[PDB]
Amino acid sequence: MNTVPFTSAPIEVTIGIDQYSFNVKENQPFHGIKDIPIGHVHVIHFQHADNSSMRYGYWFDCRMGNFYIQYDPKDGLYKMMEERDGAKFENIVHNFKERQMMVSYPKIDEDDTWYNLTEFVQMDKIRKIVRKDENQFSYVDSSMTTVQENELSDPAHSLNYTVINFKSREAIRPGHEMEDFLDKSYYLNTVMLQGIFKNSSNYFGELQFAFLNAMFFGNYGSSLQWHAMIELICSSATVPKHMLDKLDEILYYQIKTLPEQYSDILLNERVWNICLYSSFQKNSLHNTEKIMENKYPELL
Amino acid sequence: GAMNSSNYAELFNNDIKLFVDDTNVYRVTVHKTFEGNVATKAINGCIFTLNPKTGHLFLKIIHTSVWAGQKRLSQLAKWKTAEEVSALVRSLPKEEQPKQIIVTRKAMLDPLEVHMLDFPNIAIRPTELRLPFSAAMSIDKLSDVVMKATEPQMVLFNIYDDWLDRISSYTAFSRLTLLLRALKTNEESAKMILLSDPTITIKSYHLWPSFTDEQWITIESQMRDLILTEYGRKYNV
């Protein structure tokens, strides 16, 4: 189990770690998060009490370095930093633990939720979507635009998701216009899986990462990407059977975790009704259809 | 965006544009089968592609053989229309290619957009005008060429005959839409109006009769009366 210490907490803030969250009062003696499960990526995220504008946060993997949080009063945010002095780091963590100044990652033994949401998410793929090569961790916030959003404005601060556009020459073979527009299997299997992602695990990793950024930051372009990647599969008549089964599991856990009161802003009614009730795969998403109907029957 | 009564003079500016109407592409008669079921029989159709400024009509005849062994024909018809319009554009010299294509039915937007991805600078637009181009097959010489076709064929017409030597495009389009609306509403009575007087004929190289300027005024009035008469019959007014 690993630890992200905090130098201090000078401003009142809601801190998230993965799907958990807790409130820290201004100048309260908070010095970090311990017992973080090794083996998964994680995200530590922030929403200031005095200015809920900008949710922001950091994706990281404790196997790749020793990371900590320190507030910067000039830029006005909690920043992740890497500590290269390993013996300094262990000494700081040990002291804070001895004084019980850290919260414990509150995972229930029975609970696979975080694994289920991040099964295909790897730090290396995150770092290609979020480009800041000098850090081993990746910053995301609520306002960051996607590359495709910037084509339709600072490129260094963009989310480089794979562009999906159903009315593009990439999606549509000359001479197969009707075929390729009504059945997206070419675009899914040849262009995206074989050509760009190389395999379905990388496709699902980006889909899962887009969902989590939508949910944790309210990032609108991430929500667009998540829905586009679902629609591309559902609108394809020919999809490897293992992919359909795994997509159903992925979406089930996403819908299960979504905060009920955020459903109006995180779910696209058109996409979900098309995917569940009209698409080629309308009968291939049994678990997802069941939770959607029991949890969000209004959307449908 | 869409095209309506606010920007109606835009049709007659100097940017090349084409209307595309697909309502006569897939034409069927429905009839009873020997077992008491119902079956369709297709007949030849056409794509109606019109330049409203010049009157040039590119009439692509859709021969029934294009439907043989195909499914979901009403859907296929839209994609076949888009394929043929795209082919037409590619056949035109660059300086003759349209800057806008206006479809009469919004269901044509995505098929045409997808077929025209190679032409990102040609705008594909709907219209809020209700245009009576479905009545094109009430023009005898157009109906004749379509029904006689034994293979796919493109035939070029000027739907204004020689009117543009005496009137503006705006006025020619208004005359055309009034004629077509009257033929759509009551084809028999409209044709009676157009041919009642044996001394006025249709030139071999024309679609409509050779009316003088004063006779066109009379004809147009009789067409308006027909439309109003039929509106009164329909709604009991």
Ligand SMILES: NC[C@H](N)c1ccc2c(c1)OCCO2
């Ligand atoms: N080619 C110019 C255009 N078709 C036009 C406009 C007005 C006219 C006219 C011709 O004939 C003379 C009287 O009114």
